[PDB]
Design a protein around this ligand. Structure first.
Ligand SMILES: Cc1cc2nc3c(=O)[nH]c(=O)nc-3n(C[C@H](O)[C@H](O)[C@H](O)COP(=O)(O)OP(=O)(O)OC[C@H]3O[C@@H](n4cnc5c(N)ncnc54)[C@H](O)[C@@H]3O)c2cc1C
Ligand code: SF4
Ligand code: SF4
Ligand code: SF4
Ligand code: SF4
Ligand code: SF4
Ligand code: SF4
Ligand code: SF4
Ligand code: SF4
Lengths: 296, 446, 189, 252, 95
């Protein structure tokens, strides 16, 4: 019954709306209420925006935080990069006095202030936690067994790293997201260097695309050698890079990969009986049809 | 002003404690040597060879160990612990816990009233015990019975029994019949002794490197620590001195050495200090693998090779001459191949300035050293403070490295901070002299 | 490296490779410390950071060299280095550094200083344009409006796109840091 | 006497050899003991480190570590002197504290802070602002007009040649036995070691003793050591010498 | 550096920079020792040689890197390096 503001950054609503729809409905049938933010904007993307100016990054993330503050609710997220921006700026401004003062005197031009009363959670954080819906409740909410599918999990980087700035435990062989896939009935597989960056961070995916694709292709080589039927994500950046990059690796290089990659919420929807049609599988660059035929 | 009892206590039977007890006894003072373990030898008994002279550790230590046992001025109370200490430099009333040995010495058997001696050390009891437990001397790598000795060259060879693991079947009793050395129903004894001075020589243990997940010490089967490597490379170890891979038993052709493992770290997980001897036994291990296994190559992932002492730099020269590869870079992380459990070590070779991925059949971590478990409780029993690094604090960092602020208590060995064996022995002799001063004068003023 | 010759090919080929104490300006290093919020001067060059980097094996990017340049205050060498935008900010180096340094935060501070000298890839400026216009670095288009309608979703998400009044406010934030003006004057042909 | 203890100590290796460091021919190049005397309040000046060339305070001091050490060329010593890294750090701290705005450059090749509270000292020295260039000094020139010292080496980390300008250059010279120590140790029938220090009865289990009975070694004469290690060695030697005196008899 | 692509520009741009133990051939290093008549394997990379070099300040030539390559047996990297003919053989490093 716990209720959260749903920040909903750029890529999930603007290229993969099925992730948005699955997030709302799947979180609704389990005991969570995701409901919209009042005019949220791009969380200043930590790579593409935090590289050129840190103060504008602070100001925009703080504005996003104080929207939910004046909304009197704490934020839920489905993006690792959005988590980085929102959660990190929230953590920083609650402790640094002079940075918070500078942010507030910038925000005074739009008559709206930061004080630090709410918290930020990733939807995966909530899906694991015991007081909020636990793994057992998700397992119970599964209607279609969704078994017989080798699934590879990609944790991303901005959610769990660094240890000294996060609270998710070991960033070097985590198994919790693996339990999240396992609850759905899909068997998670292990592949070498599974904690490797996808390569799309820091603006690299825009700056020198071939370098970013080489980092993605290394990951894809490892994932195919493991024998994965699909890749699962907690980040629309990683979603975008894996799907479109498979399209650009097929083009730039000569490597053929037909591995569908899904955000975890589409997998939750498929496990909870949602059709491919209302998950908008057709907006993915890489067809999910082999995976659906394997599981259905 | 106050008299001093002509007795001394040395806690810890390691090389430091053994040397302190021998020095005090040779000076003519009656001394108590208190040992937690059933044998005195200490960490030096676990080493195979010694840098930089490459001498065999047991061979040098065996004469010193034999002397402590025979010496008439030393009462060697092994398998005992200090329960309580009261008093001051004049008289120290120390009460000791004689843990249940389970086996009687001939002196104790005579005192009991039976002419049958106790435990000549035949070893027939261990041949019939049906319980199989890990051996702490090899520390989990070799099997031992419920009644056991740490190794063959134990000073008191009396075959202690672990009552927490013994099922009390009574087969060793029949194996030892007509000597009646084994009493399965004995318990702890509380004794009180009066001593004039005390010497603390508690030593050290290995820092728990289950943390630092980037090196899969407990994750990957072919990742071991330094002491495990010493036990594996010794001819008296779990195998016949043949270094084999724990994963499949095959002989490795290629092993890496991760120096500063958990050391010089400010992240709050490891230790911020240098353990002062990791580099040298890493070099010794490289020499031993290159000599024993033909064609095997050692890779040392190092950062400030520290060969500072007498003949230490020449040992470094010899090791480099024998073909050891030195990559100047702290190991970033370690992966393993699922098929063949080889270990990929990822770091930079900062010299040559390039990223490096080195295959190894075996990986050895030169873990930092830590005070032993229960050392803080004992240190509080004698009223000794700790250092900022967690080691026992000395009276003055320069001109009194053995004494403490509390009178009549002196430190010796790694318990005061990591040291080599010669430095440890020098500290032990100095502590013995400092403890002998009040006893020889027979009076102190406070 | 004997002296300046005013022949550009020879000045490039005979560039002085020796570090001099006149090559160090402290001002650069404490701008880096006062922006990155990390103890950058405490690096002792263990190489764990570079050994962790996913960009190092496939390029000339070396985070350890950047840390060394920061310690020695070598501006005009770190800032004008094309391997400054190859960092993905994966935070592996920060996760593993034994000195509790965040080298990626040093990278971010260096990128800020490089932007204040008109050294910046054009994708960042394009993202600035997009966020200033619509509040979204990755904006919506007609095809996804149709897709969202087919999903039962509203055509425009509950964002500054649905509520344009907030966008002006966002603009003010950029306008406070002169970011729009710089992006415009650097995006010139 | 009944027993004897030898504590002859050490002297500085003559760094007038190894010509590429201008110890004797350049006036602003000094050794570590000279630096200690110059910076002590009881020294020739009022503790004010000044340049010997003109008496003006320096703003830039270089420290050449390993000067004549770990050297296999036959001129220097092939061993490590144990404490030159630590007192070089101490000197860098002292110059950066006493002279405001002065910068210390330590040209080092394996910083060796092994003892208790030594790594923390190294951390503190780096934190206070000392510069560490990982490179053995190749050579030293001096400018004829201003007697400042050009130090040429390579920063092997960062991989570039380097020419550092310093007002003062301090050589952390190696240590060797005092003059006349070999004659004394021959006078007591004590053999030397292959480094030239006095030999031990057993390198491991008898650091204080000697093959000749009744003679014991203490201090750096047995090998370079810190003050605490030296004191521990001296107390051990005193105990070993006192044992036969206390017993009153030596059992054959 | 993921794998070979057969696009020469991309193979040059994404060259694998990681030293591997397959990159070392001993045969190169003992040919070097049996021809140069010097104890080359005993280098511990102090950098005095590069700090002495008159060619280093005005080029990319680093004698210490060549010594490291010899120790690690990196043929096809030392031999095919244009900064191998910039040494004037002034013997300052040897000195
Ligand atoms: C892997 C490795 C390799 C090494 N190789 C070498 C080498 O080649 N050469 C060299 O010179 N040095 C070497 N060393 C260093 C050497 O081990 C130490 O210098 C030496 O062990 C110090 O002796 P100690 O008696 O102080 O320590 P210890 O041997 O640990 O002394 C402690 C003793 O006291 C006992 N004890 C502890 N606490 C209590 C208590 N509360 N009550 C009663 N008893 C207690 C312990 O059981 C033990 O017997 C090596 C060290 C390691 C870890
Ligand atoms: S069987 Fe008896 S005599 Fe033999 S070792 Fe055991 S206790 Fe001692
Ligand atoms: S009584 Fe205990 S020690 Fe004896 S044989 Fe049985 S299990 Fe072993
Ligand atoms: S002794 Fe060597 S390996 Fe051990 S902490 Fe010190 S430098 Fe590292
Ligand atoms: S890991 Fe930390 S200490 Fe090591 S080189 Fe990188 S920044 Fe410096
Ligand atoms: S954060 Fe940047 S420098 Fe650090 S490991 Fe990741 S890509 Fe490399
Ligand atoms: S103590 Fe330091 S400066 Fe002295 S010889 Fe050893 S490494 Fe060189
Ligand atoms: S070859 Fe060069 S780097 Fe190697 S030891 Fe000699 S001078 Fe130093
Ligand atoms: S001989 Fe002269 S030019 Fe050649 S590497 Fe040595 S110093 Fe440089």
């Amino acid at each position: 019954m716990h209720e959260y503001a749903f920040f909903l950054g750029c890529i999930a609503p603007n290229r993969y709306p099925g992730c948005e729809a699955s997030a709302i409905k799947t979180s609704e049938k389990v005991g969570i209420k995701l409901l919209p933010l009042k005019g949220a904007s791009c969380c200043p993307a930590p790579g593409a925006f935090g590289s050129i100016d840190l103060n504008v990054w602070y100001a925009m993330a703080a504005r996003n935080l104080v929207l939910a503050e004046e909304m009197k609710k704490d934020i839920a997220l489905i993006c690792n990069g959005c988590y980085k921006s929102i959660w990190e700026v929230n953590h920083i401004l609650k402790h640094n006095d002079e940075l918070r003062d500078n942010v507030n005197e910038v925000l005074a031009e739009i008559d709206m202030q930061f004080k630090g009363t709410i918290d930020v959670w990733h939807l995966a954080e909530l899906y694991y936690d015991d007081k909020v819906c636990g793994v057992q409740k998700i397992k119970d909410s599964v209607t279609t067994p969704l078994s017989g599918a080798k699934v590879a999990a990609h944790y991303g980087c901005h959610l769990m790293k660094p240890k000294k700035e996060r609270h998710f435990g070991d960033t070097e062989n985590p198994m919790w997201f693996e339990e999240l896939i396992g609850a759905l009935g899909a068997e998670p597989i292990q592949y070498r260097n599974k904690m490797q960056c996808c390569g799309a961070g820091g603006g690299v995916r825009g700056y020198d695309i071939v370098h970013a694709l080489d980092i993605t292709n290394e990951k894809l080589i490892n994932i195919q050698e493991a024998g994965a039927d699909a890749i699962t994500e907690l980040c629309p950046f990683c979603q975008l890079q894996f799907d479109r990059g498979q399209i650009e690796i097929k083009e730039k290089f000569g490597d053929v990969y037909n591995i569908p990659v899904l955000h975890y919420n589409e997998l939750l929807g498929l496990a909870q009986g949602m059709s491919p049609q209302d998950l908008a599988l057709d907006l993915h660059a890489i067809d999910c049809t082999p995976f659906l035929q394997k599981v259905l | 002003s106050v008299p001093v009892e002509k007795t001394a206590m040395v806690v810890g039977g390691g090389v430091a404690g053994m040397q302190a007890a021998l020095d005090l006894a040779s000076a003519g003072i009656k001394t108590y040597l208190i040992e937690r373990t059933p044998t005195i030898g200490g960490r030096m008994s676990q080493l195979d060879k010694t840098f930089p002279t490459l001498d065999c550790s047991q061979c040098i230590l065996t004469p010193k160990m034999v002397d402590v046992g025979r010496h008439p001025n030393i009462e060697m109370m092994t398998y005992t612990e200090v329960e309580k200490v009261e008093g001051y430099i004049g008289n120290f009333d120390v009460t000791l816990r004689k843990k249940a040995r389970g086996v009687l010495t001939p002196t104790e058997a005579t005192a009991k009233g039976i002419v049958g001696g106790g435990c000549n050390g035949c070893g027939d009891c261990s041949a019939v015990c049906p319980v199989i437990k890990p051996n702490p001397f090899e520390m989990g790598m070799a099997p031992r019975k419920a009644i056991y000795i740490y190794h063959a060259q134990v000073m008191p060879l009396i075959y202690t029994v672990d009552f927490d693991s013994c099922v009390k079947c009574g087969l060793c009793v029949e194996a030892c019949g007509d000597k009646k050395a084994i009493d399965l129903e004995m318990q702890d004894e509380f004794i009180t002794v009066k001593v004039g001075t005390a010497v603390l020589a508690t030593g050290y243990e290995l820092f728990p490197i289950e943390n630092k997940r980037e090196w899969g010490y407990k994750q990957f089967d072919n990742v071991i620590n330094a002491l495990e490597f010493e036990r594996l490379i010794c001819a008296s170890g779990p195998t016949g001195g043949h270094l084999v891979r724990p994963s499949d038993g095959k002989t490795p052709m290629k092993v890496g050495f991760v120096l500063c493992a958990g050391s010089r770290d400010n992240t709050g997980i490891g230790k911020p200090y240098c353990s002062r001897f990791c580099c040298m036994y890493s070099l010794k291990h490289a020499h031993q693998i290159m000599e024993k296994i033909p064609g095997a190559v050692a890779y040392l992932f190092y950062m400030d090779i520290r060969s500072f002492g007498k003949m230490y730099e020449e040992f470094y020269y010899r090791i480099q001459h024998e073909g050891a590869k030195f990559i100047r870079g702290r190991v970033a992380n370690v992966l393993e191949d699922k098929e063949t459990k080889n270990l990929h070590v990822f770091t930079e070779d900062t010299l040559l300035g390039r990223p490096v991925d080195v295959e190894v059949d075996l990986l050895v971590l030169a873990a930092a050293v830590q005070p032993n478990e229960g050392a803080n409780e004992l240190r509080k029993k004698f009223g000794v403070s700790a250092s900022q690094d967690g080691w026992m604090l000395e009276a003055h960092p320069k001109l009194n490295p053995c004494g403490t602020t509390t009178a009549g208590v002196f430190l010796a060995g790694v318990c005061q901070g990591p040291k080599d064996i010669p430095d440890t022995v020098a500290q032990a002799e100095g502590a013995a002299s400092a403890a002998s001063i009040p006893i020889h004068m027979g009076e102190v003023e406070l | 490296a004997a002296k300046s010759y005013n022949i550009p090919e020879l000045d490039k080929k005979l560039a002085d490779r020796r570090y001099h104490l006149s090559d160090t300006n402290p001002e650069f290093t404490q701008k880096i410390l006062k922006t990155s919020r990390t103890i950058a001067n405490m690096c002792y060059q263990c190489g764990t950071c570079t050994g962790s980097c996913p960009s190092a094996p496939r390029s000339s990017y070396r985070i350890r060299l950047f840390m060394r340049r920061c310690v020695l205050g070598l501006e005009n060498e770190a800032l004008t280095d094309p391997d400054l935008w190859l960092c993905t900010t994966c935070y592996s180096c920060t996760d593993r550094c034994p000195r509790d340094i965040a080298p990626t935060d040093v990278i971010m501070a260096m990128r800020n200083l490089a932007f204040k000298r008109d050294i910046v890839p054009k994708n960042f400026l394009q993202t600035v344009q997009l966020i200033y216009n619509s509040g979204h670095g990755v904006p919506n288009n007609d095809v996804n409006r149709a897709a969202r309608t087919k999903l039962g979703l509203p055509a425009d998400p509950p964002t500054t796109h649905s509520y344009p009044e907030f966008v002006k406010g966002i603009q003010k934030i950029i306008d406070h840091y002169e970011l729009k003006e710089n992006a415009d004057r650097i995006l010139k042909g």
